[PDB]
Coordinates of C-alpha atoms and ligand atoms in Angstrom, one line a residue:
Chain C
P226 CA -4.0 8.2 45.0
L227 CA -5.2 8.2 41.4
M228 CA -8.8 8.5 42.6
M229 CA -7.8 11.5 44.9
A230 CA -6.2 13.1 41.9
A231 CA -9.3 12.6 39.8
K232 CA -11.5 14.1 42.6
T233 CA -9.2 17.1 43.3
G234 CA -8.7 17.8 39.6
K235 CA -4.9 17.4 39.5
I236 CA -4.3 17.1 35.7
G237 CA -0.5 16.6 35.9
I238 CA -0.3 13.8 38.4
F239 CA -3.4 12.1 37.0
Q240 CA -1.8 12.2 33.5
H241 CA 1.4 10.8 34.9
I242 CA -0.2 8.0 36.8
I243 CA -2.4 7.0 33.9
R244 CA 0.5 6.4 31.5
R245 CA 3.4 5.7 34.0
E246 CA 6.0 3.2 32.7
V247 CA 8.8 1.9 34.9
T248 CA 11.7 0.9 32.6
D249 CA 13.4 -1.2 35.3
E250 CA 13.0 -5.0 34.8
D251 CA 12.8 -5.4 38.6
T252 CA 9.4 -3.7 38.9
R253 CA 7.2 -4.0 35.8
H254 CA 4.2 -4.6 38.1
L255 CA 3.7 -0.9 38.6
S256 CA 3.7 0.3 35.0
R257 CA 0.4 0.9 33.2
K258 CA 1.1 2.1 29.7
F259 CA 2.7 -1.1 28.4
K260 CA 4.3 -0.8 25.0
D261 CA 3.8 -3.4 22.2
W262 CA 5.5 -1.8 19.2
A263 CA 6.6 1.6 18.1
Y264 CA 7.6 2.5 14.5
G265 CA 8.0 6.2 13.7
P266 CA 5.2 8.3 15.2
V267 CA 3.1 5.3 16.2
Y268 CA 3.7 4.4 19.9
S269 CA 1.1 1.7 20.1
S270 CA 0.5 0.9 23.8
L271 CA -1.7 -1.1 26.1
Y272 CA -3.2 1.0 28.9
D273 CA -4.2 -0.9 32.1
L274 CA -7.9 -0.5 33.0
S275 CA -7.5 -0.9 36.7
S276 CA -9.9 1.4 38.5
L277 CA -11.1 2.4 35.0
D278 CA -12.9 -0.8 34.1
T279 CA -16.3 -1.0 32.6
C280 CA -17.6 -3.2 35.4
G281 CA -19.0 -1.6 38.5
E282 CA -17.5 -4.1 41.0
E283 CA -15.2 -1.3 42.3
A284 CA -15.2 2.5 42.0
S285 CA -14.7 3.7 38.5
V286 CA -12.7 6.8 37.6
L287 CA -14.9 7.4 34.6
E288 CA -17.9 7.9 37.0
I289 CA -15.8 10.1 39.3
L290 CA -14.7 12.4 36.5
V291 CA -18.1 12.6 34.8
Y292 CA -20.2 13.2 37.9
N293 CA -18.2 13.8 41.1
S294 CA -15.4 16.0 39.7
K295 CA -16.5 19.6 39.6
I296 CA -13.1 21.1 38.9
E297 CA -12.5 23.2 35.8
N298 CA -9.9 20.7 34.6
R299 CA -12.6 18.0 34.2
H300 CA -12.6 18.4 30.4
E301 CA -8.8 18.3 30.3
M302 CA -8.7 15.2 32.4
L303 CA -11.1 13.4 30.1
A304 CA -8.9 14.0 27.2
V305 CA -6.1 11.6 28.3
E306 CA -5.3 8.8 25.8
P307 CA -7.2 5.8 27.4
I308 CA -10.2 7.6 28.9
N309 CA -11.1 9.4 25.7
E310 CA -10.5 6.3 23.7
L311 CA -12.5 4.2 26.2
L312 CA -15.6 6.4 25.8
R313 CA -15.5 6.1 22.0
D314 CA -15.1 2.4 22.4
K315 CA -18.4 2.2 24.4
Chain J
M1 CA -0.5 0.6 -21.9
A2 CA -0.2 0.6 -18.1
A3 CA -0.4 -2.8 -16.5
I4 CA -2.9 -2.9 -13.7
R5 CA -2.1 -4.9 -10.6
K6 CA -4.6 -7.3 -9.0
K7 CA -4.2 -8.9 -5.6
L8 CA -4.7 -12.6 -5.6
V9 CA -5.0 -14.7 -2.4
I10 CA -4.9 -18.5 -2.4
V11 CA -6.3 -20.1 0.8
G12 CA -6.8 -23.8 1.5
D13 CA -6.1 -26.8 3.7
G14 CA -2.7 -28.2 4.5
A15 CA -1.0 -29.8 1.5
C16 CA -3.7 -29.1 -1.1
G17 CA -1.4 -27.9 -3.9
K18 CA -1.5 -24.1 -3.2
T19 CA 2.2 -23.3 -3.2
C20 CA 2.8 -25.8 -6.0
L21 CA 0.1 -24.2 -8.1
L22 CA 1.5 -20.8 -7.5
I23 CA 5.0 -21.9 -8.4
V24 CA 3.8 -23.7 -11.5
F25 CA 2.0 -20.6 -12.6
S26 CA 4.9 -18.2 -11.9
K27 CA 8.2 -20.0 -12.6
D28 CA 6.6 -22.6 -15.0
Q29 CA 8.5 -25.4 -13.3
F30 CA 6.9 -27.8 -10.8
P31 CA 9.1 -27.8 -7.6
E32 CA 11.1 -31.0 -7.3
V33 CA 12.3 -31.2 -3.7
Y34 CA 12.2 -28.0 -1.8
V35 CA 8.6 -26.6 -2.1
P36 CA 8.3 -23.6 0.2
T37 CA 5.6 -23.4 2.8
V38 CA 4.4 -20.1 1.3
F39 CA 5.2 -18.5 -2.1
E40 CA 5.3 -14.9 -1.2
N41 CA 6.1 -11.5 -2.7
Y42 CA 5.8 -12.5 -6.4
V43 CA 4.0 -10.6 -9.2
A44 CA 3.1 -12.6 -12.3
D45 CA 2.4 -11.0 -15.8
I46 CA -0.7 -12.2 -17.5
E47 CA -2.8 -11.0 -20.5
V48 CA -6.3 -12.2 -21.2
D49 CA -7.7 -9.7 -23.8
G50 CA -4.7 -7.5 -24.5
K51 CA -5.0 -5.8 -21.1
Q52 CA -1.8 -6.6 -19.2
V53 CA -2.5 -7.6 -15.6
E54 CA 0.2 -8.1 -12.9
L55 CA -1.2 -10.7 -10.4
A56 CA 0.2 -10.1 -6.9
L57 CA 0.1 -13.7 -5.8
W58 CA -0.4 -13.9 -2.1
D59 CA 0.0 -17.3 -0.4
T60 CA -1.5 -18.4 3.0
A61 CA -0.6 -21.3 5.2
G62 CA -2.2 -22.9 8.2
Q63 CA 1.0 -24.2 9.9
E64 CA 2.8 -22.8 13.0
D65 CA 2.4 -19.0 13.2
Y66 CA 1.2 -18.7 9.5
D67 CA -2.4 -19.3 10.8
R68 CA -2.1 -16.2 13.0
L69 CA -0.8 -13.9 10.3
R70 CA -3.1 -15.3 7.5
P71 CA -5.8 -12.8 8.3
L72 CA -3.4 -9.9 7.6
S73 CA -3.1 -11.1 4.0
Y74 CA -6.8 -10.7 3.3
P75 CA -7.0 -6.9 3.2
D76 CA -7.0 -5.2 -0.2
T77 CA -7.6 -8.5 -2.0
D78 CA -9.2 -8.6 -5.5
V79 CA -9.8 -12.3 -6.0
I80 CA -9.8 -15.3 -3.6
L81 CA -8.7 -18.7 -4.9
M82 CA -9.9 -21.2 -2.3
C83 CA -8.1 -24.5 -2.8
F84 CA -9.1 -28.1 -2.1
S85 CA -7.5 -31.4 -3.0
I86 CA -9.3 -33.7 -5.5
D87 CA -7.4 -36.5 -3.9
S88 CA -8.6 -36.0 -0.3
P89 CA -12.2 -34.8 -0.2
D90 CA -12.0 -33.8 3.5
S91 CA -10.9 -30.4 2.2
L92 CA -14.0 -30.3 0.0
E93 CA -16.4 -30.9 2.9
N94 CA -14.5 -28.6 5.2
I95 CA -14.6 -25.7 2.7
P96 CA -18.1 -24.4 3.6
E97 CA -17.6 -24.9 7.3
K98 CA -14.4 -22.9 7.7
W99 CA -12.9 -21.4 4.6
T100 CA -16.0 -19.8 3.0
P101 CA -17.0 -17.9 6.3
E102 CA -13.4 -17.0 6.9
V103 CA -13.0 -15.5 3.4
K104 CA -16.3 -13.7 3.5
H105 CA -15.8 -12.2 6.9
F106 CA -12.5 -10.4 5.9
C107 CA -13.3 -10.1 2.2
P108 CA -16.8 -8.9 1.6
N109 CA -18.0 -8.4 -2.0
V110 CA -14.8 -10.0 -3.3
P111 CA -15.0 -12.7 -6.1
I112 CA -14.5 -16.2 -4.8
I113 CA -13.2 -19.2 -6.8
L114 CA -12.7 -22.7 -5.5
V115 CA -10.2 -24.8 -7.5
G116 CA -9.7 -28.6 -7.5
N117 CA -5.9 -29.0 -7.1
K118 CA -4.3 -32.4 -7.5
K119 CA -6.6 -33.2 -10.5
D120 CA -4.1 -35.9 -11.7
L121 CA -4.8 -38.0 -8.6
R122 CA -8.5 -38.5 -9.6
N123 CA -7.4 -41.5 -11.7
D124 CA -4.4 -42.4 -9.7
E125 CA -4.5 -46.0 -8.4
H126 CA -2.5 -45.4 -5.2
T127 CA -4.7 -42.4 -4.2
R128 CA -7.9 -44.4 -5.0
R129 CA -6.7 -47.3 -2.9
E130 CA -5.8 -45.0 0.0
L131 CA -9.2 -43.3 -0.2
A132 CA -11.0 -46.7 -0.3
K133 CA -9.0 -47.7 2.8
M134 CA -10.8 -44.8 4.5
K135 CA -14.1 -45.4 2.6
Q136 CA -13.7 -42.3 0.4
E137 CA -13.8 -41.5 -3.3
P138 CA -12.1 -38.8 -5.3
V139 CA -14.0 -35.5 -5.7
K140 CA -16.2 -35.6 -8.8
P141 CA -16.5 -32.6 -11.1
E142 CA -20.3 -32.7 -10.4
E143 CA -19.4 -32.6 -6.7
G144 CA -17.2 -29.6 -7.3
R145 CA -20.1 -27.8 -9.1
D146 CA -22.4 -28.8 -6.2
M147 CA -19.9 -27.3 -3.7
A148 CA -19.6 -24.1 -5.8
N149 CA -23.5 -23.9 -5.7
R150 CA -23.5 -23.8 -1.9
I151 CA -20.9 -21.0 -1.7
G152 CA -22.1 -19.2 -4.9
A153 CA -18.5 -18.9 -6.1
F154 CA -17.5 -17.3 -9.4
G155 CA -16.5 -20.7 -10.8
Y156 CA -14.9 -24.2 -10.3
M157 CA -12.0 -25.4 -12.4
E158 CA -9.6 -28.3 -11.6
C159 CA -5.8 -27.9 -11.7
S160 CA -3.0 -30.4 -11.8
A161 CA 0.3 -28.6 -10.9
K162 CA 2.5 -31.7 -11.5
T163 CA 1.2 -32.1 -15.1
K164 CA 0.8 -28.3 -15.7
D165 CA -2.7 -28.8 -16.9
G166 CA -5.3 -26.2 -15.9
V167 CA -2.7 -24.0 -14.2
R168 CA -3.3 -21.2 -16.7
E169 CA -7.1 -21.0 -17.3
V170 CA -7.7 -20.9 -13.5
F171 CA -5.5 -17.7 -13.2
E172 CA -7.1 -16.3 -16.3
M173 CA -10.5 -16.7 -14.8
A174 CA -9.3 -15.3 -11.5
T175 CA -7.9 -12.1 -13.2
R176 CA -11.0 -11.8 -15.3
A177 CA -13.1 -11.9 -12.1
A178 CA -10.8 -9.4 -10.5
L179 CA -11.1 -7.1 -13.4
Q180 CA -14.8 -6.8 -12.7
Chain H
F2 CA 21.6 -15.6 15.1
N3 CA 18.5 -14.1 16.6
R4 CA 16.3 -11.1 15.7
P5 CA 17.2 -8.9 18.8
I6 CA 20.9 -9.5 18.0
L7 CA 20.4 -9.2 14.3
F8 CA 18.5 -5.9 14.5
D9 CA 21.3 -4.5 16.7
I10 CA 24.1 -5.7 14.4
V11 CA 22.2 -4.1 11.5
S12 CA 21.5 -0.9 13.5
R13 CA 25.1 -0.4 14.5
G14 CA 26.3 -1.2 10.9
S15 CA 28.9 -3.7 12.2
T16 CA 29.8 -6.1 9.3
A17 CA 32.3 -7.8 11.6
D18 CA 29.5 -9.1 13.8
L19 CA 27.4 -10.2 10.8
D20 CA 30.0 -12.7 9.4
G21 CA 28.4 -15.8 10.9
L22 CA 24.8 -15.1 9.8
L23 CA 25.2 -17.1 6.5
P24 CA 26.5 -20.3 8.0
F25 CA 23.8 -20.2 10.7
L26 CA 21.1 -19.7 8.1
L27 CA 22.4 -22.5 5.8
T28 CA 22.9 -25.0 8.6
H29 CA 19.5 -24.2 10.2
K30 CA 17.7 -23.9 6.8
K31 CA 16.3 -20.5 8.0
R32 CA 15.9 -17.4 5.9
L33 CA 16.0 -13.7 6.5
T34 CA 12.3 -13.4 5.7
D35 CA 11.3 -15.9 8.3
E36 CA 9.0 -14.6 11.1
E37 CA 11.8 -15.3 13.6
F38 CA 13.7 -12.4 11.9
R39 CA 10.8 -10.0 11.4
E40 CA 9.4 -7.6 14.0
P41 CA 5.9 -8.7 15.0
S42 CA 2.9 -6.4 14.4
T43 CA 5.1 -4.5 12.0
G44 CA 6.6 -6.9 9.5
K45 CA 9.9 -5.0 9.2
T46 CA 12.9 -7.1 8.1
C47 CA 16.6 -6.2 8.6
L48 CA 16.7 -4.2 5.4
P49 CA 14.4 -1.3 6.6
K50 CA 16.4 -1.2 9.8
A51 CA 19.6 -0.8 7.8
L52 CA 18.0 1.8 5.6
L53 CA 16.9 3.8 8.7
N54 CA 20.2 3.7 10.7
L55 CA 22.5 5.4 8.2
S56 CA 25.8 6.9 9.2
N57 CA 27.7 9.1 6.7
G58 CA 24.8 8.2 4.3
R59 CA 26.0 4.6 4.0
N60 CA 25.5 1.3 5.8
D61 CA 28.0 -1.4 4.9
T62 CA 25.6 -4.1 6.4
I63 CA 23.2 -3.6 3.4
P64 CA 25.6 -5.1 0.8
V65 CA 26.3 -8.0 3.2
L66 CA 22.6 -8.6 3.9
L67 CA 21.9 -8.5 0.1
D68 CA 24.7 -11.0 -0.6
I69 CA 23.5 -13.3 2.2
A70 CA 19.9 -13.1 1.0
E71 CA 21.0 -14.0 -2.5
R72 CA 22.9 -17.0 -1.2
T73 CA 19.9 -18.2 0.8
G74 CA 17.7 -17.7 -2.3
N75 CA 15.4 -14.9 -0.8
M76 CA 16.4 -11.9 -2.8
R77 CA 13.0 -10.8 -4.3
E78 CA 11.3 -11.9 -1.1
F79 CA 13.8 -10.1 1.1
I80 CA 13.9 -6.8 -0.7
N81 CA 10.2 -6.6 -1.6
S82 CA 8.9 -7.6 1.9
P83 CA 6.1 -5.1 2.8
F84 CA 5.0 -3.8 6.2
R85 CA 2.0 -5.6 7.6
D86 CA 0.9 -3.1 10.2
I87 CA -2.2 -0.9 9.9
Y88 CA -0.5 2.4 9.5
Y89 CA 2.3 1.4 7.1
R90 CA 0.9 -1.5 5.0
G91 CA 2.5 -2.0 1.6
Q92 CA 5.6 0.1 2.4
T93 CA 8.6 -1.9 1.0
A94 CA 12.3 -0.9 1.4
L95 CA 12.2 1.1 -1.9
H96 CA 9.9 3.6 -0.3
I97 CA 12.2 3.9 2.7
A98 CA 15.2 4.3 0.5
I99 CA 13.5 7.0 -1.5
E100 CA 12.1 9.0 1.5
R101 CA 15.5 8.9 3.1
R102 CA 16.9 10.7 0.0
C103 CA 19.6 8.0 -0.6
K104 CA 20.0 7.6 -4.3
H105 CA 22.8 5.1 -3.9
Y106 CA 20.7 2.5 -2.0
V107 CA 17.7 3.2 -4.4
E108 CA 20.0 2.1 -7.3
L109 CA 21.2 -0.8 -5.2
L110 CA 17.7 -2.0 -4.5
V111 CA 16.3 -1.5 -8.0
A112 CA 19.3 -3.3 -9.6
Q113 CA 18.8 -6.3 -7.4
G114 CA 15.2 -6.5 -8.4
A115 CA 13.1 -4.3 -6.1
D116 CA 9.4 -4.0 -6.9
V117 CA 9.4 -0.6 -8.5
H118 CA 5.5 -0.6 -8.6
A119 CA 4.9 -1.4 -4.9
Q120 CA 1.8 0.3 -3.5
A121 CA 1.9 1.6 0.1
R122 CA -1.7 1.2 1.4
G123 CA -1.2 2.2 5.1
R124 CA -3.3 4.8 6.9
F125 CA -0.3 7.1 6.9
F126 CA -0.4 7.0 3.1
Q127 CA -4.0 8.2 2.8
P128 CA -5.2 11.7 2.1
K129 CA -5.5 14.0 5.1
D130 CA -9.2 14.1 4.5
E131 CA -9.4 10.3 4.9
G132 CA -7.3 10.3 8.1
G133 CA -3.7 10.2 6.9
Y134 CA -0.5 12.2 6.9
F135 CA 1.5 11.7 3.7
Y136 CA -0.4 10.9 0.5
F137 CA 2.2 10.7 -2.3
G138 CA 0.4 8.5 -4.8
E139 CA 1.4 5.2 -3.1
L140 CA 4.0 4.5 -5.8
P141 CA 7.8 4.6 -5.4
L142 CA 8.1 6.9 -8.5
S143 CA 5.2 9.1 -7.2
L144 CA 7.0 9.3 -3.8
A145 CA 10.1 10.6 -5.5
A146 CA 8.1 13.0 -7.6
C147 CA 6.2 14.4 -4.5
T148 CA 9.4 14.5 -2.5
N149 CA 11.1 16.9 -5.1
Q150 CA 13.8 14.4 -6.1
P151 CA 14.3 14.8 -9.8
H152 CA 17.4 12.6 -10.0
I153 CA 15.7 9.6 -8.4
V154 CA 12.7 10.2 -10.7
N155 CA 15.0 10.2 -13.7
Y156 CA 16.7 7.0 -12.5
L157 CA 13.5 5.2 -11.8
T158 CA 12.2 6.1 -15.2
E159 CA 15.5 5.3 -17.0
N160 CA 16.7 2.1 -15.3
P161 CA 18.6 -0.4 -17.4
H162 CA 16.9 -3.2 -15.3
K163 CA 13.3 -2.1 -14.7
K164 CA 11.8 1.3 -15.4
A165 CA 8.8 2.6 -13.5
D166 CA 6.2 3.5 -16.0
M167 CA 4.6 6.9 -15.4
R168 CA 1.1 5.9 -16.6
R169 CA 0.5 3.6 -13.6
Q170 CA -2.3 4.4 -11.2
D171 CA -2.7 3.5 -7.5
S172 CA -5.7 1.9 -5.8
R173 CA -7.5 5.3 -6.0
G174 CA -6.5 5.7 -9.6
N175 CA -4.2 8.7 -9.1
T176 CA -1.2 8.7 -11.4
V177 CA 2.0 10.6 -10.7
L178 CA 0.5 13.8 -12.1
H179 CA -2.5 13.3 -9.8
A180 CA -0.2 12.8 -6.9
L181 CA 1.6 16.0 -7.6
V182 CA -1.7 17.9 -7.2
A183 CA -2.5 16.4 -3.8
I184 CA 1.0 17.3 -2.4
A185 CA 0.9 20.9 -3.9
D186 CA 0.3 23.8 -1.5
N187 CA -0.3 27.4 -2.5
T188 CA 3.1 28.6 -1.2
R189 CA 5.7 29.9 -3.7
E190 CA 8.2 27.1 -3.1
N191 CA 5.5 24.4 -3.6
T192 CA 4.2 26.1 -6.7
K193 CA 7.8 26.4 -7.9
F194 CA 8.9 22.7 -7.7
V195 CA 5.5 21.0 -8.1
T196 CA 5.0 22.6 -11.5
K197 CA 8.6 21.9 -12.5
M198 CA 8.3 18.2 -11.7
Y199 CA 4.8 18.1 -13.4
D200 CA 6.3 19.5 -16.6
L201 CA 9.3 17.2 -16.3
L202 CA 7.1 14.1 -16.0
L203 CA 4.7 15.3 -18.7
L204 CA 7.5 15.8 -21.2
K205 CA 9.1 12.5 -20.2
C206 CA 5.9 10.7 -20.9
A207 CA 5.4 12.6 -24.1
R208 CA 8.8 11.6 -25.5
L209 CA 8.7 8.0 -24.2
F210 CA 5.1 7.4 -25.3
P211 CA 4.4 9.8 -28.2
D212 CA 0.8 8.5 -28.6
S213 CA -0.3 8.8 -25.0
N214 CA -1.1 12.0 -23.0
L215 CA -0.4 11.5 -19.3
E216 CA -2.9 14.3 -18.4
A217 CA -5.8 12.4 -20.0
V218 CA -5.9 9.4 -17.7
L219 CA -8.8 9.9 -15.2
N220 CA -8.7 8.4 -11.8
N221 CA -11.4 6.4 -10.1
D222 CA -13.3 9.7 -9.6
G223 CA -13.0 10.6 -13.3
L224 CA -10.9 13.7 -12.7
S225 CA -7.9 14.7 -14.8
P226 CA -5.1 16.5 -13.0
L227 CA -6.5 19.9 -14.1
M228 CA -10.0 18.8 -12.8
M229 CA -8.5 17.6 -9.5
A230 CA -6.6 20.8 -9.1
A231 CA -9.8 22.8 -9.7
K232 CA -11.7 20.6 -7.2
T233 CA -9.1 20.4 -4.4
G234 CA -8.3 24.2 -4.2
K235 CA -4.8 24.2 -5.7
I236 CA -4.4 27.4 -7.6
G237 CA -0.7 27.4 -8.5
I238 CA -0.7 24.1 -10.4
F239 CA -4.1 25.1 -11.8
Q240 CA -2.7 28.3 -13.4
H241 CA 0.4 26.5 -14.5
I242 CA -1.5 23.8 -16.3
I243 CA -3.9 26.2 -18.0
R244 CA -1.1 28.7 -19.0
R245 CA 1.3 25.9 -20.1
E246 CA 3.9 26.8 -22.7
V247 CA 6.6 24.4 -23.9
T248 CA 9.3 25.2 -26.4
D249 CA 10.6 21.8 -27.5
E250 CA 9.4 21.0 -31.0
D251 CA 9.0 17.3 -30.4
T252 CA 6.7 18.0 -27.4
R253 CA 5.2 21.3 -28.5
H254 CA 1.7 19.7 -28.7
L255 CA 1.4 19.8 -24.9
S256 CA 1.0 23.6 -24.9
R257 CA -2.2 25.1 -23.7
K258 CA -1.3 28.7 -24.4
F259 CA -0.4 29.6 -28.0
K260 CA 0.9 33.2 -28.6
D261 CA -0.8 34.0 -31.8
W262 CA 0.9 37.4 -32.4
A263 CA 2.8 40.1 -30.5
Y264 CA 3.1 43.8 -31.1
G265 CA 5.5 45.2 -28.5
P266 CA 4.1 44.8 -25.0
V267 CA 0.7 43.7 -26.4
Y268 CA 0.5 40.1 -27.3
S269 CA -2.5 37.9 -28.2
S270 CA -2.5 34.3 -27.0
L271 CA -4.9 31.5 -27.7
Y272 CA -6.0 29.5 -24.6
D273 CA -7.0 25.9 -25.1
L274 CA -10.7 25.4 -24.0
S275 CA -10.1 21.7 -23.3
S276 CA -11.8 20.4 -20.2
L277 CA -12.9 24.0 -19.5
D278 CA -15.7 24.5 -22.0
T279 CA -16.4 20.9 -23.2
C280 CA -20.1 21.5 -24.3
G281 CA -21.5 19.1 -21.6
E282 CA -20.6 15.7 -23.1
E283 CA -17.5 15.7 -20.8
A284 CA -16.7 17.1 -17.4
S285 CA -15.9 20.8 -17.3
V286 CA -13.4 22.7 -15.0
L287 CA -15.9 25.6 -14.8
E288 CA -18.7 23.3 -13.4
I289 CA -16.2 21.9 -10.8
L290 CA -15.2 25.4 -9.8
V291 CA -18.7 26.8 -9.5
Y292 CA -20.2 23.7 -7.7
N293 CA -17.7 21.4 -6.0
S294 CA -14.8 23.8 -5.3
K295 CA -15.8 24.9 -1.9
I296 CA -12.3 26.2 -1.2
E297 CA -11.8 29.9 -0.5
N298 CA -9.6 30.0 -3.7
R299 CA -12.8 29.7 -5.9
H300 CA -13.0 33.5 -6.4
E301 CA -9.2 33.5 -7.2
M302 CA -9.5 30.6 -9.8
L303 CA -12.5 32.3 -11.4
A304 CA -10.1 35.1 -12.3
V305 CA -7.6 33.2 -14.4
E306 CA -7.1 34.8 -17.8
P307 CA -9.2 32.4 -20.0
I308 CA -11.9 31.5 -17.3
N309 CA -12.7 35.1 -16.5
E310 CA -13.2 36.0 -20.2
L311 CA -14.7 32.6 -20.9
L312 CA -17.6 33.3 -18.5
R313 CA -17.8 36.9 -19.8
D314 CA -18.0 35.8 -23.5
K315 CA -20.9 33.5 -22.6
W316 CA -22.8 36.5 -21.2
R317 CA -22.6 38.4 -24.5
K318 CA -23.6 35.5 -26.6
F319 CA -26.7 34.0 -24.9
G320 CA -26.4 35.3 -21.3
Ligands
LIG1 N1 0.0 -35.7 -7.9 C1 0.1 -34.4 -7.6 N2 0.8 -34.0 -6.5 C2 0.9 -32.7 -6.2 C3 0.2 -31.7 -7.1 N3 0.5 -30.5 -6.5 C4 1.2 -30.7 -5.4 N4 1.5 -32.0 -5.2 C5 2.2 -32.5 -4.1 O1 1.6 -32.2 -2.9 C6 2.5 -31.8 -1.9 C7 2.0 -30.7 -1.1 O2 1.8 -29.5 -1.9 P1 2.1 -28.1 -1.3 O3 2.0 -27.1 -2.4 O4 3.4 -28.2 -0.6 O5 1.0 -27.8 -0.2 P2 0.6 -26.4 0.3 O6 1.9 -25.8 0.9 O7 -0.5 -26.6 1.3 O8 0.1 -25.7 -0.9 C8 3.8 -31.4 -2.7 O9 5.0 -31.9 -2.1 C9 3.6 -31.9 -4.1 O10 4.6 -32.8 -4.4 C10 -0.5 -32.2 -8.2 O11 -1.1 -31.4 -9.0 N5 -0.5 -33.5 -8.4
LIG2 MG1 1.9 -23.8 1.1

């Protein structure tokens, strides 16, 4: 689903799926933007890198957005918090 | 005039007289029973040449979670007082292996001073016998200068917190190096 | 009992649930500054949590916490415990009590022995150029001065216990007067309270230390407050400093504009050419304006009454 959103250039659902948190204790397995600490403006979080990993073992969303995605929202979709920070990390 | 504030960080092995040295310098009284694991959040007033300096004494420990949060004390430091026990030389040989790289990796271009705490035990009979049981001898002053040569530290002076001897000139040298 | 329970009792301000803290700490030999009672990756103790969750401007759990901390021996450690995180490093509880505009708790903290010269070195306390939000001078007195809180400034400079000296500089060397120039915008309100607090602090430092001028202590960059105002594009404080007039006879030597004579509407006033035309051996405001003042206000600061004529007078002489 996330890969389909990346290919089809759906900014809203991709942005939601990237940083989705489930507050329920029953299902923390599905959350991605885990929260460590948050004082004032800082909302320090740990984004999961599943399907976004540096390794090429599986399809990478970075590759899809950079090359395959031809939608006009490509620049908008690269500006999400982990993807933009991941590229600067490299 | 205005009293400048210098950040001082004391690092060393377990039970090498760090907190005792800090308490002797600050409160002027050697702790009798309850010596804290870390002496934290204290500023000490000192004057060397008429320039008042407030030494922000930061203490570090290597016990329980203190080892994990010790790196966070290093930022913004002005002088590093690495500590080793004259009694037990194991601290002396483990300085260049662990403490010197640790200090340098988080505190580049910061003055480094290694101090021989527990100076009174050098001539103690009990400590000498305990070292001889393990085939060891108390750290010599020449050995201390030889250790300072390897690191290239600012200086080497010995302190004896229990006797309150050397507990002042060491901090005077530390604040003089920090003033640089 | 435990930090999730303690930070909730403190947050709710329920002294009735905080009764058993002292017997627990004494029988377990634990202290309120222990890592088991501090938020990880932040370093916040219970006191900042109490100073943030204020109802009706008061939190009754703060006196109880202070009393318990004194009983357990950690008073200076408890009050002066600084944040350890990257973005807030150095922030003690005094900065939080001053930023929250609660003078009562500022007095309570300073009386018990708060570190009045605690420097906040976090990234949020760096200049906007360096990647920060609120640069106030890093000092608790400078925070109050830059927050437009004259009463807290007067208290901190007139404590019976411990007075914050106004000549202190932060890691960058900026004093309170230097910190009032980095928080000064060109709006009318900013130019109307920044100058007022600047004059208040300058006169206070003149009376308290007659032999010292607070405007003559350069920072690590060698810039006096006038020089920094010229460099950083602050025109209101720049004009106020240059055209300064003070009426008090005890502190009349701080004037930079001296009305020499007046005939009706016309009046002749001498302007002090100090730090403006210093003959090269010192730094000059004119050089800073014409070289390093890249702001768009350069053509507006080169029109101040002495500077405009100072440049013109040079043209007639040798120009
Ligand atoms: N003989 C002697 N004993 C000391 C001296 N300084 C500290 N001690 C003892 O060494 C023990 C450990 O010191 P401490 O400061 O707790 O170690 P740290 O926490 O690692 O600095 C203390 O209980 C002191 O009684 C000294 O100068 N001479
Ligand atoms: Mg210790």
